[PDB]
Design a protein around this ligand. Sequence first.
Ligand SMILES: Nc1ncnc2c1ncn2[C@@H]1O[C@H](COP(=O)(O)OP(=O)(O)O)[C@@H](O)[C@H]1O
Ligand SMILES: Nc1ncnc2c1ncn2[C@@H]1O[C@H](COP(=O)(O)OP(=O)(O)O)[C@@H](O)[C@H]1O
Ligand code: ICS
Ligand code: CLF
Ligand code: SF4
Ligand SMILES: [Be+2]
Ligand SMILES: [Be+2]
Ligand SMILES: [Fe+3]
Ligand SMILES: [Mg+2]
Ligand SMILES: [Mg+2]
Lengths: 472, 522, 271, 270
Amino acid sequence: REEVESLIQEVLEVYPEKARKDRNKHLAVNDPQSKKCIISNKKSQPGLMTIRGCAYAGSKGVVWGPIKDMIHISHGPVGCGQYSRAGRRNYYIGTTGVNAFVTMNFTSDFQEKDIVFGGDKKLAKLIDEVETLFPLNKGISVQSECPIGLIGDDIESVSKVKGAELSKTIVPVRCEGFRGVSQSLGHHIANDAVRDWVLGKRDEDTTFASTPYDVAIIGDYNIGGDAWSSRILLEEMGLRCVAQWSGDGSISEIELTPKVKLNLVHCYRSMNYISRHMEEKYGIPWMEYNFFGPTKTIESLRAIAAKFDESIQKKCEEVIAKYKPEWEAVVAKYRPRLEGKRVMLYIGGLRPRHVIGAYEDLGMEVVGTGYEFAHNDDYDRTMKEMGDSTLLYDDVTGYEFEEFVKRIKPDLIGSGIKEKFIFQKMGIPFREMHSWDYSGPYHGFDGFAIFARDMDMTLNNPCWKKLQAPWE
Amino acid sequence: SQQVDKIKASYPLFLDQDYKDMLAKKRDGFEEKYPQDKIDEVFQWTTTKEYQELNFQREALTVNPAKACQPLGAVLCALGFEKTMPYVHGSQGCVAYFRSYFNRHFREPVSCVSDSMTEDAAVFGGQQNMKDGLQNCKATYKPDMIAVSTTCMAEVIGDDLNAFINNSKKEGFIPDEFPVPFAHTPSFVGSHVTGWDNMFEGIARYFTLKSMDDKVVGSNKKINIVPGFETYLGNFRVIKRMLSEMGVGYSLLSDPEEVLDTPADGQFRMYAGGTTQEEMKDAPNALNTVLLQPWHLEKTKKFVEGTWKHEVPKLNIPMGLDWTDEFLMKVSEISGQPIPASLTKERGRLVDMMTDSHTWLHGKRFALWGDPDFVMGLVKFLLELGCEPVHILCHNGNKRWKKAVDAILAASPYGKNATVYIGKDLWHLRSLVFTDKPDFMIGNSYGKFIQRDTLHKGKEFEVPLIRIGFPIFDRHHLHRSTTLGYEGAMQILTTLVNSILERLDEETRGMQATDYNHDLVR
Amino acid sequence: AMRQCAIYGKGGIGKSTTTQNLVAALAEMGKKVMIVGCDPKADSTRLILHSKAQNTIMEMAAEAGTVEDLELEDVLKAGYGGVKCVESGGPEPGVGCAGRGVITAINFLEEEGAYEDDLDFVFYDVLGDVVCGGFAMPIRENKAQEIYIVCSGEMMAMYAANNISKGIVKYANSGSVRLGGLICNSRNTDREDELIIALANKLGTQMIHFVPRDNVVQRAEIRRMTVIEYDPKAKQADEYRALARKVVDNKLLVIPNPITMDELEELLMEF
Amino acid sequence: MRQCAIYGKGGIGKSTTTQNLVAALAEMGKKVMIVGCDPKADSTRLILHSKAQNTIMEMAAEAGTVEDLELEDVLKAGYGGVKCVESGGPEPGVGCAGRGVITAINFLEEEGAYEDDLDFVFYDVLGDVVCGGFAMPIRENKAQEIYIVCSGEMMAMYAANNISKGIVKYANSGSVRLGGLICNSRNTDREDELIIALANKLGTQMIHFVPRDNVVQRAEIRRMTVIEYDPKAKQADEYRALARKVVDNKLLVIPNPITMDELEELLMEF
Ligand SMILES: Nc1ncnc2c1ncn2[C@@H]1O[C@H](COP(=O)(O)OP(=O)(O)O)[C@@H](O)[C@H]1O
Ligand SMILES: Nc1ncnc2c1ncn2[C@@H]1O[C@H](COP(=O)(O)OP(=O)(O)O)[C@@H](O)[C@H]1O
Ligand code: ICS
Ligand code: CLF
Ligand code: SF4
Ligand SMILES: [Be+2]
Ligand SMILES: [Be+2]
Ligand SMILES: [Fe+3]
Ligand SMILES: [Mg+2]
Ligand SMILES: [Mg+2]
């Protein structure tokens, strides 16, 4: 414990005084009430290379983007959309340009005259042109950028008028980037957008035939097909998955969600708001599940079955028995190549604590973890999972992460793209934990095999033994 | 299910029968998808000329643009100076996006900071953000210079960068003599190339405007080279190599080749190479200033002619054969050094490859897109090859550039079927390649989605893509290639001829149907 | 039952002063009147809250971090006659973005339900120039339903009134906001009565009242009070209550008809 | 060339005072040009003898950019050869006018506008300086002389103090200074009671005072400037006096903004 504190102080001795006090409160030594240990969801210190994004990234790129039959307009200048087009691997099935629009970049392409004179007229004309050119679209969302929030364009009025005139749902999202301190407020704003404009459209409709085994997957964005790899298990247990939020998700599934019997929430940080709203309004119980690795998958499946009758529990036992030999074989094959290794993680708001069980299932220890934009409840949850005298960092900077890695010297680092090559040039294997290094899925029993194979091919790749020239 | 012997990733795992049944049940039950026949009719309609006429009347909607915003180019220009920190005064999500974009293109660490303005900073200004960010950045990362750009938020609210920096220096946040050049880079005008130009003009102004009393032209016997927005490292390398083989003294301003190509030897080098402050200070003393990409170096050209009194040559980008010769001849005239035998030999080698591949290259129809100078150089080189550019697209182009490209096309019999489009995006280009099918496209990774659409119309309608431009995301290490000079001409030539030959081999691989033309020798 | 009204007009015409005087008169008559100042100068609530208006939404928003953290009781301060007052605040001149401040303050007030108590009147006092969509936030949907433009003689007052009507037209069509009348804040001029009467008829609105220029207003402002609180006896305190009653009983709500100001310049030549 | 900026409370009579001032400097020998800074462009009406309806912003929108905007299409002559360029912006309640100020001033910098033989460029700014864009006239290399126009009424003096607070940062970061306090009238009890007091408390002076002359309003009705409508009146003589003080102004101290308590005490002090 003392060594970790000493390293924290040594790293902190480089920042100016105000920066030093501010950064002191976001680093802690884990002791398995996070508020008394670490504080989160605070403004980043200027000029320190934070990793966090903006509210637009957390709204358009995370929540609304994966919705496939909708058209999402990045309202403002061209940069945001361009940089966020197809950057996230929220998989889907559809015909792009006809009935699916996830990998497309729709934008208003603001000019100087748009800023000076307003863009509501251009927004209405853009909606008309979208309706003309993409007839099979089932909705429109308008994601605001920074100038839209600054100049006070009344996009809500335009959305209402055009939704009345062309009889389709237009969701205005006030996700201008300067709002908040990270993507968390973008998640929140997108969730109230769904609540106010989409969720309650079928509140007076009783045409849907509901079964006692109705569940809705909440907060799974289908990274590399992850949601699919989960859904099959839930369907092999006799449950009917009505909706997926929002990976490969449709506006119809979101509209149908208030009819389910149970809400299985994967990502708390991004969808807990809508989960609580649905519990309070429609009375649907919701709970968290974890499908990372076999042990957490089995525990989650049994917990899910326990909410239903005996037939579901019997089918759950059958599913566990069926998939047991596969994950046992994967363990027996890949564990000896991985036992004893150490991992340091820095992911956004949910994954730093969910992937720990899968790492443990291969005999690997996590010595450091942290979040980009998580709140205090996330740290409350992750304190139990993390080991004693480990390291926790909230909104870590480039210098702090580099120094922490230099002194701790982990065997593997799992984090985003902006430090992948940084840690690659320091000779430490690195595994993208956002895009799964363009691999996956990692959820479920099928994803566990891919996770293990990726871990082995990265940790044990010979290239890491060749960074020193034989003559030096 | 997974077999431990052959683990399947998403492809081809999701092609198993269980996953197909799961997807079928989900789609049939809860997605409310349109009938497949309706989707086919709509897709067919999107490939028709009527849909192209509907698409080309767009005045407010942009779909799949081919440009980025100014601060990206400002950051790229800032990275070309030694121990320089790109500092984007504005919001953080932008610097996050800039870094992500550049890591995906270069597969390299990219260093850039933000002052992370919040709603309170938008309402009250970003002066305190300026001070705290400058102090924190200098203390933490220890640059010799901080190059300040802006995000749009800051531009809209009129944040005075000069006043904020001066107040920072006066209140002791950073030393008075520490160089902090700045440039206003509003994202709602121009594109990334404009941001590069504005940042370079800001740096040149900061280092040269007030100290011109002791400068005389031609005293250091060098030529200033301004590369502009360049994402091929081989371009910097070939310019430097050609000048060095020539014996010409030169100063490459904003050279990021080292910082973007650091070796993996166990340590992380945040700064590498780059133009030095001494070179910037001595720049007015050069014989002349050569702009490699004059069509997005307008403000720099105005500053250099007006202040440094350099008679900037009217040179096209040194791409292809003719324009590389005109660049070499102009440099020889300015410096007085003759063109060495090595350059003549390498030109003759390029001509030899041209005559070797002209038979396969002749008459081929290409669509292409990218930045203005790059696009016009590609057009010129294709004209020199006997190829037929058909759809020339530049989203960030202007009317003067379009007139210049029209003049370039009208001078060759291979430009009669060529139309230049400005302000049009890749959805327009999708319509164009559906209605007037070319043989190939030449452009960045975003064109792959066009290829898919063409293949959905049929194998015979498919237009293969050739990845020359920025950004390239789905291929590895293509950023190491060269496009300028004779070397870039040979690389482009080889890529084109081998793409044509690979397509021809693909169309003639069918046994007892088309293999009669599956020739060993091509 | 809560009537929402917004006060616009040319800068320096007396919006803030006339607004506070009425709120005082309405309070004396008996009704709960919220004041919302959409001026970064934090000057709209000084004759009623006395003091200098102190706390603002933006300043404690900055102090407490983001706008979400701050609690409604911090910025909401009741004053004379139970008149609850709030001021958006903003930056010192020449920096920042005041329109975003007004936008944030208005959203803050809605989501915390400041208006949505059992009030009787809400009066927004907007800046004179209205250079962006943020300062038109008080006249969006579900916002102020009546607009009062304060003007006077000369040429700049009617010019600004016409331009503000031009700007109002778009929100009047997009929503349910309407122009209720014109308040003539006499400066010293001659024939300004006929000027403003003609201008109101040209625009389709009415002259709801005429306020004489009296120095008791200055005297009360020096001592940080309205005239209703300074001295009820004096004249110029009578036709504050007068136009208070007239506003209470007002029913002519119209969409303005802006006039090509060659017509207005002609009208200046005639009247 | 003396690039000056006319600031102050909204509606206190800036473009009026500014226009008659520049017209008095005109037909005195000097060459001036007015640059407005508020979307409702009428700061050159008196000199132009007509509202412009031709401002930088609308013409830029018509052509497409400021790059296609030729300078001769927005600059016009007037009474005494006074150049006038109105720059303009959106209708109230929409768009962003400060960005329009930024673009138009940058356009005037790029296209050779200020580099003529004129003496004073008089920028004239709206009363509600709500963002940094409207502070462009007091940036570096921009106007160097600020003349806060304010009256004896309390609210105008408070606005003047707020403006001084705002321009402190630009003054410290640059070289633009507070030339003096221009006093209009509302026929109050002040006129030295809180105008000289505020000026000396701001470390500055009141550079001449112009009272509530009724002639100015009836000259405004006539599209006129007072010296052009009644060239032999008392208001016109007062306006040559103001022009003379502007000619020989040398007090250019940095503003010292007094606090709110000081203003409240000063109100009772006089
Ligand atoms: N009826 C009146 N008689 C005399 N002075 C007045 C009258 N109305 C307003 N004033 C004075 O005019 C000044 C400007 O008023 P203000 O409330 O600032 O208007 P605005 O908010 O539209 O600028 C105030 O300081 C006030 O003392
Ligand atoms: N000295 C004066 N005598 C009489 N009226 C004046 C005088 N100065 C200004 N005014 C009147 O007051 C109005 C002020 O409007 P304006 O000049 O636009 O002020 P600002 O530019 O500060 O808004 C003018 O229309 C004018 O008629
Ligand atoms: S939504 Fe969030 S950064 Fe919960 S913004 Fe981010 S697809 Fe991360 S740790 Mo990218 S809070 Fe999802 C996330 Fe986690 S985009 Fe994905 S991997 S589980
Ligand atoms: S927080 Fe404006 S165009 Fe978009 S990249 Fe930025 S300079 Fe360029 Fe940033 S990403 Fe956007 S602009 Fe804001 S909402 Fe988030
Ligand atoms: S004009 Fe309005 S929206 Fe634009 S910067 Fe100024 S206050 Fe903000
Ligand atoms: Be006012
Ligand atoms: Be004004
Ligand atoms: Fe690399
Ligand atoms: Mg007011
Ligand atoms: Mg004016």
